[PDB]
Amino acid sequence: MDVFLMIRRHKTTIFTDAKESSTVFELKRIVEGILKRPPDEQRLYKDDQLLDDGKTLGECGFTSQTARPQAPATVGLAFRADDTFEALCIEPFSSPPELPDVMK
Amino acid sequence: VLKPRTLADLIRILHQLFAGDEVNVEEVQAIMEAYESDPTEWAMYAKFDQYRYTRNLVDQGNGKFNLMILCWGEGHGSSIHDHTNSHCFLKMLQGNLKETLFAWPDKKSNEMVKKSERVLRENQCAYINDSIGLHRVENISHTEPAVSLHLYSPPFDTCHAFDQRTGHKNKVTMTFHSKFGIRTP
Amino acid sequence: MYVKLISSDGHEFIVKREHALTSGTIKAMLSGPGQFAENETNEVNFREIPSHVLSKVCMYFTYKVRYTNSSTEIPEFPIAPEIALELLMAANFLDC
Amino acid sequence: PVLRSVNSREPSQVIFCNRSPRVVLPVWLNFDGEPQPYPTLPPGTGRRIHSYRGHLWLFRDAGTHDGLLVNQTELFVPSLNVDGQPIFANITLPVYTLKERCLQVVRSLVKPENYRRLDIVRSLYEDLEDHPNVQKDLERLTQERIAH
Ligand SMILES: CC(=O)N[C@H](C(=O)N1C[C@H](O)C[C@H]1C(=O)NCc1ccc(-c2scnc2C)cc1)C(C)(C)C
Ligand SMILES: [Fe+2]
């Protein structure tokens, strides 16, 4: 069973997938393969809650109907400065113009 | 016997027959039975509704007679109806229908009486008027539809519906699902 | 295997390469002689597609890649009305 | 006309299965090749219907005439019931292009009288007005079969 995620930090967002039965550490492993930072220099969040390295994604809340290809779930990412960690920061996307009245 | 080669031929013949001074309902029925149903020749009038049967007008017949095709789903059926003193012919194009004939009501409400009950096999053509009684037609099949060819002379928009339990009347005005092959909502 | 798509407002979107080739114009860019030489960075700037629609576009990418060979049922791709007009312009440009 | 049902008169029971989120309109192609519609199927519903070997079907959104797939092709022809088992026709969404999916959506929200009041390049006004139609698709499909 596959979940579909956007891993987000600052203005960088990653589109990737994983199995509901794969763990958070395993997810840092592939974030390592993309932005080249080891999992010990990474923090992963679901909204505001830091995620345990050994908890499986299904156990953190990412499941079949919560993280779908056409509507992926969001995973926050924070790196280590080199002493300790930065604050979790994610810039939102832009906003669409207000709906034309011709479309009700 | 005059054997209609096509459905159009049968329609050309009927127009001639109803142009004469006297209509012989034995000869009309015989010639309608004679036409061997060919779906390529009437498929355009075969339109189905999931919930009820459909009335599909084909020819309004120079004001002297109506020609319709009715389309019966699985389990679809008429109500107990009269024919407003007009001749009525029914020919099977596809499937079967069970005709159940009822006698008219005694005046105080009571369950009407089944006089007879018969099945109409394909290409068979029946005749009914108010002189023989009132009927109700249903498609008994659980798996296949029914398609029938109706001729009513004079044409009528009106007739009466009968509660089998009481016999009291409610008179209806009949819709048309299509006219000449075109949907009419 | 991954390529970086950059929006007009500077949002970076890293998606799988074979996902991005869902776009006919991206496939034209990167499958022929426009392929990134290794001395280059795997970045494509879309300087007129804002981030709220570009993010939507990669959602379609994963959707299409996931359900193209599904054989019994697929969901509908949802489009909010506010982004519908802007999304339709990005799809016409991206040819997908 | 090449896309026509053949008058086989050999019956063939069929299961129509709508596993789309749309209201499906079954469309039969008569012996002259003209389309005739049939009762609509709500989402999630299945019905066992009466048909014949060699008859041509296709399936559309009953409200927008968007095209639908049936066993992952757009045309459906039943064979003969081998051993009296039914034939299954599985109606699904296709994976629309993003463009055709947005055009579906904004046709859903703005009346055609007002397409050209939208600030989009006029290349897309004509695209909006090119409403999905089944004889335009028949056009394509017959000329797809001529080129074997
Ligand atoms: C001998 C022949 O080919 N007959 C045709 C015929 O019976 N057909 C044509 C197609 O094969 C389907 C078949 C038919 O009309 N079947 C009855 C039917 C009624 C409702 C439905 C549906 S579709 C969705 N819900 C329902 C209930 C499907 C078929 C007609 C009578 C239309 C010329
Ligand atoms: Fe009658």
Coordinates of C-alpha atoms and ligand atoms in Angstrom, one line a residue:
Chain A
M1 CA 0.0 0.0 0.0
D2 CA 1.6 3.2 -1.3
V3 CA 1.3 6.7 0.2
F4 CA 2.2 9.8 -1.8
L5 CA 4.0 12.7 -0.2
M6 CA 5.4 16.2 -0.7
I7 CA 8.4 16.6 1.5
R8 CA 8.7 20.4 2.1
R9 CA 11.3 22.8 3.4
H10 CA 11.6 26.5 2.7
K11 CA 10.9 26.8 -1.1
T12 CA 11.9 23.2 -1.9
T13 CA 9.2 20.5 -2.2
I14 CA 9.9 16.8 -3.2
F15 CA 7.3 14.6 -4.9
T16 CA 7.9 11.0 -3.9
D17 CA 6.1 7.9 -2.7
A18 CA 6.6 5.1 -0.2
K19 CA 4.9 2.1 1.4
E20 CA 2.6 2.7 4.4
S21 CA 4.7 -0.1 6.0
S22 CA 8.0 1.8 5.4
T23 CA 9.5 3.6 8.4
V24 CA 10.5 7.3 8.9
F25 CA 14.2 6.5 8.9
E26 CA 13.8 4.8 5.5
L27 CA 12.3 8.1 4.3
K28 CA 15.3 10.1 5.5
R29 CA 17.4 7.6 3.5
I30 CA 15.8 8.7 0.2
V31 CA 15.8 12.4 1.2
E32 CA 19.6 11.7 1.6
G33 CA 19.7 10.5 -2.0
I34 CA 18.1 13.8 -3.2
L35 CA 19.5 16.6 -1.0
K36 CA 22.6 14.7 0.2
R37 CA 22.3 15.0 4.0
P38 CA 22.5 12.0 6.3
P39 CA 19.5 11.0 8.3
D40 CA 21.2 12.1 11.5
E41 CA 21.0 15.6 10.2
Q42 CA 17.3 15.5 9.4
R43 CA 14.0 16.2 11.2
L44 CA 10.7 15.0 9.7
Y45 CA 7.3 16.4 10.9
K46 CA 3.6 15.8 10.3
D47 CA 2.2 19.3 10.8
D48 CA 3.9 20.2 14.1
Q49 CA 4.8 16.7 15.5
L50 CA 8.3 15.4 15.1
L51 CA 8.3 11.8 13.7
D52 CA 10.1 8.9 15.4
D53 CA 12.8 7.4 13.2
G54 CA 11.5 3.8 13.8
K55 CA 7.8 4.5 13.5
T56 CA 6.1 3.3 10.3
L57 CA 4.4 5.9 8.2
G58 CA 1.0 4.3 8.6
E59 CA 1.5 4.7 12.4
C60 CA 2.3 8.4 12.0
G61 CA -0.9 9.1 10.0
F62 CA 0.0 8.6 6.3
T63 CA -2.4 6.1 4.8
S64 CA -4.3 5.1 1.7
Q65 CA -6.9 7.9 1.8
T66 CA -4.8 10.6 3.5
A67 CA -1.9 10.6 1.0
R68 CA -3.1 10.0 -2.6
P69 CA -1.3 10.7 -5.9
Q70 CA -3.7 13.5 -6.9
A71 CA -3.7 14.9 -3.3
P72 CA -0.4 14.0 -1.6
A73 CA 0.2 14.6 2.1
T74 CA 2.9 17.0 3.4
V75 CA 6.0 16.1 5.4
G76 CA 8.0 18.9 6.9
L77 CA 11.8 18.9 6.7
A78 CA 14.4 20.6 8.8
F79 CA 18.2 20.2 8.6
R80 CA 20.9 20.6 11.2
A81 CA 23.0 23.8 11.1
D82 CA 25.9 21.8 12.3
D83 CA 25.5 22.2 16.1
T84 CA 21.7 21.7 16.3
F85 CA 18.6 22.1 14.2
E86 CA 17.0 24.9 12.4
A87 CA 13.3 25.8 13.1
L88 CA 10.9 24.1 10.7
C89 CA 10.2 26.6 8.0
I90 CA 7.9 26.1 5.0
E91 CA 6.9 28.9 2.7
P92 CA 3.3 28.5 1.3
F93 CA 2.6 28.4 -2.4
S94 CA 1.2 31.5 -4.1
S95 CA -2.5 32.2 -4.0
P96 CA -4.9 32.1 -7.0
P97 CA -6.8 35.2 -8.0
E98 CA -10.3 35.5 -6.6
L99 CA -12.8 33.5 -8.5
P100 CA -14.2 35.3 -11.7
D101 CA -17.8 36.0 -11.1
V102 CA -18.5 34.4 -14.5
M103 CA -17.8 31.1 -12.7
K104 CA -20.3 31.9 -10.0
Chain B
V1 CA -53.2 -13.3 -47.8
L2 CA -51.1 -10.2 -48.6
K3 CA -47.6 -10.7 -47.1
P4 CA -45.8 -7.4 -46.2
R5 CA -42.3 -7.6 -47.5
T6 CA -41.0 -4.8 -45.1
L7 CA -42.3 -2.7 -42.3
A8 CA -42.7 0.2 -44.7
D9 CA -44.8 -2.1 -46.9
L10 CA -47.0 -3.0 -44.0
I11 CA -47.5 0.8 -43.3
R12 CA -48.3 1.5 -46.9
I13 CA -50.9 -1.3 -46.9
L14 CA -52.5 -0.1 -43.7
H15 CA -53.0 3.4 -45.0
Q16 CA -54.8 2.0 -48.0
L17 CA -57.0 -0.3 -45.8
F18 CA -58.1 2.5 -43.5
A19 CA -58.8 4.8 -46.4
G20 CA -61.7 2.6 -47.5
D21 CA -65.3 3.0 -46.2
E22 CA -65.4 -0.2 -44.1
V23 CA -62.5 -1.4 -42.0
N24 CA -62.3 -5.2 -41.7
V25 CA -60.5 -5.9 -38.5
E26 CA -60.0 -9.6 -39.4
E27 CA -58.0 -8.6 -42.5
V28 CA -55.9 -5.9 -40.6
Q29 CA -54.9 -8.4 -37.9
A30 CA -54.1 -11.1 -40.5
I31 CA -51.8 -8.8 -42.5
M32 CA -50.0 -7.5 -39.4
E33 CA -49.4 -11.1 -38.3
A34 CA -48.0 -11.7 -41.8
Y35 CA -45.2 -9.2 -41.5
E36 CA -42.1 -11.0 -40.1
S37 CA -40.5 -8.7 -37.6
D38 CA -37.2 -7.4 -38.8
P39 CA -35.3 -5.3 -36.2
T40 CA -33.2 -3.5 -38.8
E41 CA -36.5 -1.9 -40.0
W42 CA -37.8 -0.6 -36.6
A43 CA -34.7 -0.3 -34.4
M44 CA -34.9 3.5 -34.5
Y45 CA -38.2 3.4 -32.6
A46 CA -36.9 1.1 -29.9
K47 CA -36.0 3.3 -27.0
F48 CA -36.0 2.0 -23.4
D49 CA -36.7 3.5 -20.0
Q50 CA -35.4 1.7 -16.9
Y51 CA -38.5 2.4 -14.8
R52 CA -41.6 2.2 -17.1
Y53 CA -42.4 1.1 -20.6
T54 CA -42.1 3.7 -23.4
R55 CA -44.6 4.9 -26.0
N56 CA -42.9 5.6 -29.3
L57 CA -45.1 7.1 -32.0
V58 CA -44.3 6.0 -35.6
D59 CA -47.2 7.2 -37.9
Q60 CA -50.2 9.4 -37.1
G61 CA -51.9 7.9 -40.0
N62 CA -53.8 10.7 -41.7
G63 CA -55.9 11.3 -38.6
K64 CA -57.7 8.0 -39.0
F65 CA -55.3 5.7 -37.1
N66 CA -52.3 5.8 -34.9
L67 CA -49.2 3.6 -35.2
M68 CA -46.9 3.2 -32.2
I69 CA -44.2 1.0 -30.9
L70 CA -44.0 0.2 -27.2
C71 CA -40.8 -0.9 -25.4
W72 CA -41.1 -3.1 -22.3
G73 CA -38.2 -3.7 -19.9
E74 CA -37.8 -6.7 -17.7
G75 CA -40.9 -6.8 -15.5
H76 CA -42.7 -3.8 -17.1
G77 CA -46.4 -3.8 -17.5
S78 CA -49.5 -1.8 -18.3
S79 CA -52.4 -0.9 -16.0
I80 CA -55.9 -2.2 -16.4
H81 CA -57.2 0.1 -19.1
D82 CA -60.0 0.8 -21.6
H83 CA -59.7 1.8 -25.3
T84 CA -62.2 4.7 -25.6
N85 CA -64.3 2.9 -28.2
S86 CA -61.6 2.4 -30.7
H87 CA -60.1 -0.7 -32.4
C88 CA -56.7 -1.8 -31.2
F89 CA -54.2 -4.1 -32.7
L90 CA -51.1 -5.4 -31.0
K91 CA -48.2 -7.2 -32.8
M92 CA -45.1 -8.7 -31.3
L93 CA -41.8 -7.5 -32.8
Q94 CA -39.5 -9.0 -30.2
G95 CA -40.1 -10.8 -26.9
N96 CA -43.4 -11.9 -25.4
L97 CA -46.2 -10.3 -23.5
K98 CA -48.9 -11.7 -21.2
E99 CA -52.3 -10.3 -22.0
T100 CA -54.7 -10.6 -19.0
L101 CA -58.3 -9.8 -19.9
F102 CA -60.7 -8.4 -17.3
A103 CA -64.4 -7.9 -17.3
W104 CA -65.9 -4.5 -16.5
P105 CA -66.8 -3.6 -12.9
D106 CA -70.0 -4.2 -11.1
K107 CA -71.0 -0.8 -9.6
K108 CA -70.0 -1.3 -6.0
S109 CA -66.3 -1.8 -5.4
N110 CA -65.0 -5.4 -5.6
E111 CA -62.0 -7.2 -7.1
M112 CA -62.5 -7.4 -10.9
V113 CA -62.7 -10.8 -12.6
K114 CA -60.0 -12.3 -14.8
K115 CA -61.9 -13.6 -17.9
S116 CA -58.8 -15.0 -19.7
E117 CA -55.0 -14.9 -19.7
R118 CA -52.7 -15.7 -22.6
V119 CA -49.2 -15.2 -23.8
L120 CA -48.4 -13.5 -27.1
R121 CA -45.5 -15.1 -28.9
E122 CA -43.3 -13.4 -31.4
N123 CA -45.0 -12.1 -34.6
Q124 CA -48.4 -12.9 -33.2
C125 CA -51.0 -10.1 -33.5
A126 CA -53.9 -9.6 -31.2
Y127 CA -57.1 -7.5 -31.4
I128 CA -59.0 -5.7 -28.6
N129 CA -61.9 -3.2 -28.2
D130 CA -64.2 -2.3 -25.4
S131 CA -66.7 -4.8 -26.7
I132 CA -64.4 -7.7 -25.7
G133 CA -63.3 -6.2 -22.4
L134 CA -60.4 -4.6 -20.8
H135 CA -56.9 -6.0 -20.5
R136 CA -53.5 -5.4 -19.0
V137 CA -50.3 -6.3 -20.8
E138 CA -47.0 -7.2 -19.1
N139 CA -43.5 -8.5 -20.1
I140 CA -43.3 -11.6 -17.9
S141 CA -39.6 -12.3 -18.7
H142 CA -37.0 -11.7 -15.9
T143 CA -34.2 -11.5 -18.5
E144 CA -35.4 -10.2 -21.9
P145 CA -37.2 -7.1 -23.1
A146 CA -40.4 -6.9 -25.2
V147 CA -41.2 -4.8 -28.3
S148 CA -44.7 -4.5 -29.6
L149 CA -46.4 -2.7 -32.5
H150 CA -49.7 -1.0 -31.7
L151 CA -52.4 0.3 -34.1
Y152 CA -55.3 2.3 -32.6
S153 CA -58.1 3.6 -34.7
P154 CA -59.5 6.1 -34.0
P155 CA -56.4 7.5 -32.3
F156 CA -56.8 8.5 -28.7
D157 CA -54.9 10.4 -26.1
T158 CA -57.4 9.5 -23.3
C159 CA -58.4 6.3 -21.5
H160 CA -59.2 5.1 -18.0
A161 CA -57.1 3.2 -15.4
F162 CA -58.8 0.6 -13.2
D163 CA -57.9 -0.5 -9.7
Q164 CA -58.1 -4.3 -9.7
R165 CA -59.0 -4.4 -6.0
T166 CA -62.1 -2.0 -6.2
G167 CA -62.8 -1.5 -9.9
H168 CA -63.1 2.2 -9.6
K169 CA -61.8 4.3 -12.4
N170 CA -59.1 6.9 -12.8
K171 CA -58.7 8.3 -16.3
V172 CA -55.3 9.0 -17.7
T173 CA -53.8 10.9 -20.6
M174 CA -50.9 9.0 -22.2
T175 CA -47.4 10.4 -22.7
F176 CA -45.0 9.8 -25.6
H177 CA -41.4 8.9 -25.0
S178 CA -40.5 9.5 -28.6
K179 CA -42.1 10.8 -31.8
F180 CA -40.9 9.5 -35.2
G181 CA -37.6 8.4 -33.6
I182 CA -36.8 11.6 -31.7
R183 CA -36.9 11.9 -27.9
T184 CA -39.7 14.2 -26.6
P185 CA -39.4 15.1 -22.9
Chain C
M1 CA 16.5 10.3 -11.9
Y2 CA 15.1 13.5 -10.3
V3 CA 14.8 16.9 -12.0
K4 CA 14.1 20.3 -10.5
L5 CA 11.1 22.4 -11.8
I6 CA 11.1 26.0 -10.7
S7 CA 8.0 28.2 -10.6
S8 CA 7.7 31.9 -11.4
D9 CA 7.6 32.8 -7.7
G10 CA 10.8 30.7 -7.1
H11 CA 9.4 27.5 -5.6
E12 CA 11.6 24.5 -6.5
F13 CA 9.8 21.2 -7.2
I14 CA 11.9 18.1 -7.4
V15 CA 10.0 15.2 -9.1
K16 CA 11.0 12.0 -10.8
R17 CA 12.3 12.5 -14.4
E18 CA 9.9 9.9 -15.9
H19 CA 7.1 11.7 -14.1
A20 CA 7.9 15.1 -15.6
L21 CA 8.0 13.5 -19.1
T22 CA 4.2 13.3 -18.7
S23 CA 4.5 16.8 -20.2
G24 CA 4.8 16.7 -24.0
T25 CA 7.0 19.9 -24.1
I26 CA 9.2 18.7 -21.2
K27 CA 9.6 15.4 -23.0
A28 CA 10.6 17.3 -26.1
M29 CA 13.1 19.3 -24.1
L30 CA 14.8 16.5 -22.2
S31 CA 14.6 13.5 -24.5
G32 CA 16.5 14.8 -27.5
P33 CA 19.6 16.9 -27.7
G34 CA 18.3 19.2 -24.9
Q35 CA 19.0 16.6 -22.3
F36 CA 21.1 17.9 -19.5
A37 CA 24.8 17.3 -19.9
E38 CA 26.3 16.3 -16.6
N39 CA 28.2 19.6 -16.4
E40 CA 24.7 21.2 -16.2
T41 CA 22.1 21.5 -13.4
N42 CA 18.8 19.6 -13.8
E43 CA 16.7 22.7 -13.5
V44 CA 13.9 24.0 -15.7
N45 CA 12.6 27.5 -15.0
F46 CA 8.9 28.1 -15.7
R47 CA 8.9 31.9 -15.3
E48 CA 5.2 32.3 -15.9
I49 CA 3.7 29.3 -14.1
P50 CA 3.1 30.2 -10.4
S51 CA 3.8 27.7 -7.6
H52 CA 0.2 27.0 -6.7
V53 CA -0.4 25.7 -10.2
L54 CA 3.1 24.1 -10.7
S55 CA 2.6 22.1 -7.5
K56 CA -0.8 21.0 -9.0
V57 CA 0.9 20.0 -12.2
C58 CA 3.2 17.5 -10.5
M59 CA 0.2 16.2 -8.6
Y60 CA -1.2 15.3 -12.1
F61 CA 2.2 13.8 -12.9
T62 CA 2.1 11.3 -10.1
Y63 CA -1.7 10.7 -10.8
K64 CA -1.1 9.9 -14.4
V65 CA 1.9 7.7 -13.8
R66 CA 0.1 5.8 -11.1
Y67 CA -3.2 5.1 -12.8
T68 CA -2.2 4.8 -16.5
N69 CA -2.1 1.0 -16.3
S70 CA -4.6 0.4 -13.6
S71 CA -7.1 -2.0 -15.0
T72 CA -10.4 -1.9 -13.0
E73 CA -11.0 1.5 -11.5
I74 CA -9.3 4.9 -11.3
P75 CA -10.3 8.0 -9.2
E76 CA -11.1 11.4 -10.7
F77 CA -8.5 14.1 -10.8
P78 CA -9.8 17.0 -8.6
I79 CA -9.5 20.6 -9.8
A80 CA -10.6 23.4 -7.5
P81 CA -12.4 26.3 -9.4
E82 CA -9.9 29.0 -8.3
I83 CA -7.0 27.2 -10.0
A84 CA -9.0 25.9 -13.0
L85 CA -8.3 28.8 -15.3
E86 CA -4.6 29.1 -14.4
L87 CA -4.2 25.3 -14.5
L88 CA -5.7 25.1 -18.0
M89 CA -3.2 27.6 -19.3
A90 CA -0.3 25.6 -17.8
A91 CA -1.6 22.4 -19.3
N92 CA -1.9 24.0 -22.7
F93 CA 1.7 25.2 -22.5
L94 CA 3.0 22.0 -21.0
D95 CA 1.1 19.8 -23.6
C96 CA -0.3 17.3 -21.2
Chain D
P1 CA -20.7 2.4 -42.2
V2 CA -18.0 0.3 -40.6
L3 CA -18.9 0.9 -36.9
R4 CA -22.3 -0.8 -36.8
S5 CA -23.9 -3.6 -34.9
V6 CA -24.5 -6.7 -37.0
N7 CA -28.0 -8.1 -36.9
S8 CA -27.1 -11.4 -35.3
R9 CA -30.2 -12.2 -33.4
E10 CA -28.0 -14.5 -31.2
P11 CA -28.6 -13.2 -27.7
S12 CA -25.8 -12.4 -25.2
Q13 CA -26.4 -11.5 -21.6
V14 CA -24.1 -8.7 -20.4
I15 CA -23.2 -7.1 -17.1
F16 CA -22.8 -3.3 -17.3
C17 CA -20.6 -2.2 -14.4
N18 CA -20.1 1.5 -13.7
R19 CA -17.0 1.8 -11.7
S20 CA -16.6 5.5 -12.5
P21 CA -17.7 8.5 -10.4
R22 CA -19.9 9.7 -13.3
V23 CA -23.4 8.9 -14.3
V24 CA -22.8 6.6 -17.2
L25 CA -24.8 6.8 -20.4
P26 CA -24.7 3.5 -22.4
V27 CA -24.7 4.2 -26.1
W28 CA -25.7 1.4 -28.6
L29 CA -24.8 1.7 -32.2
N30 CA -27.7 0.5 -34.4
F31 CA -27.4 -1.4 -37.6
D32 CA -27.1 1.8 -39.6
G33 CA -24.3 3.0 -37.3
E34 CA -26.4 5.7 -35.6
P35 CA -26.1 6.1 -31.8
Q36 CA -29.2 5.4 -29.6
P37 CA -28.9 6.0 -25.9
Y38 CA -30.0 3.6 -23.1
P39 CA -30.9 4.1 -19.4
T40 CA -28.3 5.8 -17.3
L41 CA -26.2 3.9 -14.7
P42 CA -25.4 5.7 -11.4
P43 CA -21.9 5.4 -10.0
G44 CA -21.2 2.1 -8.4
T45 CA -24.2 0.3 -9.9
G46 CA -24.2 -2.9 -12.0
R47 CA -27.0 -4.3 -14.1
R48 CA -27.4 -7.4 -16.2
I49 CA -28.8 -6.4 -19.6
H50 CA -30.0 -8.1 -22.7
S51 CA -27.8 -7.8 -25.9
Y52 CA -26.6 -9.8 -28.9
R53 CA -23.3 -10.9 -30.3
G54 CA -21.7 -8.4 -32.7
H55 CA -23.4 -5.3 -31.2
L56 CA -21.4 -2.2 -30.6
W57 CA -21.4 -0.2 -27.4
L58 CA -19.7 2.8 -26.0
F59 CA -20.2 4.8 -22.7
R60 CA -20.2 8.5 -21.9
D61 CA -20.8 10.9 -19.0
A62 CA -24.6 11.3 -19.1
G63 CA -24.3 15.0 -18.4
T64 CA -21.3 16.2 -20.3
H65 CA -20.8 13.4 -22.9
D66 CA -17.2 13.0 -21.7
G67 CA -15.9 9.8 -23.1
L68 CA -15.5 6.7 -20.8
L69 CA -13.6 3.5 -21.1
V70 CA -15.0 0.0 -21.1
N71 CA -12.6 -2.8 -20.2
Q72 CA -9.9 -0.1 -20.9
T73 CA -10.9 0.4 -24.5
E74 CA -13.6 2.8 -25.8
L75 CA -15.7 0.3 -27.8
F76 CA -17.3 -2.9 -26.5
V77 CA -18.5 -5.8 -28.5
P78 CA -19.7 -8.9 -26.7
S79 CA -18.8 -12.4 -28.0
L80 CA -21.2 -15.3 -27.5
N81 CA -22.0 -16.5 -24.0
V82 CA -19.8 -19.6 -23.7
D83 CA -21.6 -22.0 -21.4
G84 CA -24.2 -19.3 -20.6
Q85 CA -21.8 -17.3 -18.5
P86 CA -22.4 -13.5 -18.7
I87 CA -20.0 -11.1 -20.4
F88 CA -18.6 -8.3 -18.2
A89 CA -18.2 -4.6 -19.4
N90 CA -16.3 -2.6 -16.8
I91 CA -16.9 1.1 -17.1
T92 CA -14.0 3.3 -15.9
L93 CA -12.7 6.8 -16.1
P94 CA -9.8 7.2 -18.6
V95 CA -6.7 9.0 -17.5
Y96 CA -7.6 12.4 -19.1
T97 CA -4.9 14.8 -20.2
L98 CA -4.6 17.6 -17.7
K99 CA -5.9 20.0 -20.4
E100 CA -9.0 17.9 -21.2
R101 CA -9.6 17.6 -17.5
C102 CA -9.5 21.3 -16.8
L103 CA -11.7 22.0 -19.9
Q104 CA -14.2 19.6 -18.4
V105 CA -14.1 21.5 -15.1
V106 CA -14.5 25.0 -16.4
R107 CA -17.3 23.9 -18.8
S108 CA -18.8 22.7 -15.6
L109 CA -18.6 26.2 -14.0
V110 CA -19.2 28.8 -16.8
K111 CA -22.1 28.7 -19.4
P112 CA -21.0 28.6 -23.0
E113 CA -22.5 32.0 -23.7
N114 CA -19.7 33.3 -21.5
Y115 CA -16.6 31.3 -22.4
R116 CA -15.1 34.3 -24.2
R117 CA -15.5 36.5 -21.1
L118 CA -12.6 34.5 -19.5
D119 CA -9.1 36.0 -19.7
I120 CA -7.4 33.1 -21.3
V121 CA -5.6 33.0 -24.7
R122 CA -8.3 32.6 -27.4
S123 CA -6.6 29.3 -28.5
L124 CA -8.6 27.9 -25.5
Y125 CA -12.0 29.5 -26.4
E126 CA -12.3 27.2 -29.4
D127 CA -11.0 24.3 -27.3
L128 CA -13.8 24.9 -24.7
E129 CA -16.4 25.2 -27.5
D130 CA -15.2 21.8 -29.0
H131 CA -17.6 20.0 -26.6
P132 CA -17.1 16.3 -26.3
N133 CA -19.4 14.6 -28.9
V134 CA -19.9 10.9 -29.8
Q135 CA -20.1 11.2 -33.5
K136 CA -16.9 13.2 -33.6
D137 CA -15.3 10.3 -31.7
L138 CA -17.0 7.8 -34.1
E139 CA -15.3 9.8 -36.9
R140 CA -11.9 9.2 -35.2
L141 CA -12.6 5.5 -34.4
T142 CA -13.7 4.4 -37.8
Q143 CA -10.6 6.0 -39.3
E144 CA -8.5 4.4 -36.6
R145 CA -9.8 1.0 -37.7
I146 CA -9.3 1.6 -41.4
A147 CA -5.6 2.0 -40.6
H148 CA -5.3 -1.6 -39.2
Ligands
LIG1 C1 -32.8 -8.3 -32.1 C2 -32.1 -7.0 -31.7 O1 -31.0 -6.7 -32.1 N1 -32.9 -6.2 -30.9 C3 -32.4 -4.9 -30.4 C4 -32.2 -5.1 -28.9 O2 -32.9 -5.8 -28.1 N2 -31.1 -4.5 -28.3 C5 -30.1 -3.6 -28.9 C6 -28.9 -3.8 -27.9 O3 -28.2 -5.0 -28.1 C7 -29.5 -3.9 -26.6 C8 -30.8 -4.7 -26.8 C9 -31.9 -4.1 -26.0 O4 -32.6 -3.2 -26.4 N3 -32.1 -4.6 -24.7 C10 -33.0 -4.1 -23.7 C11 -32.3 -3.2 -22.7 C12 -33.0 -2.5 -21.8 C13 -32.4 -1.7 -20.8 C14 -30.9 -1.7 -20.8 C15 -30.3 -0.9 -19.7 S1 -28.8 -0.1 -20.0 C16 -28.7 0.5 -18.4 N4 -29.7 0.1 -17.6 C17 -30.6 -0.7 -18.4 C18 -31.8 -1.3 -17.6 C19 -30.2 -2.4 -21.7 C20 -30.9 -3.2 -22.7 C21 -33.5 -3.8 -30.6 C22 -34.9 -4.3 -30.1 C23 -33.2 -2.5 -30.0 C24 -33.6 -3.7 -32.1
FE2 FE -54.8 -1.7 -24.3

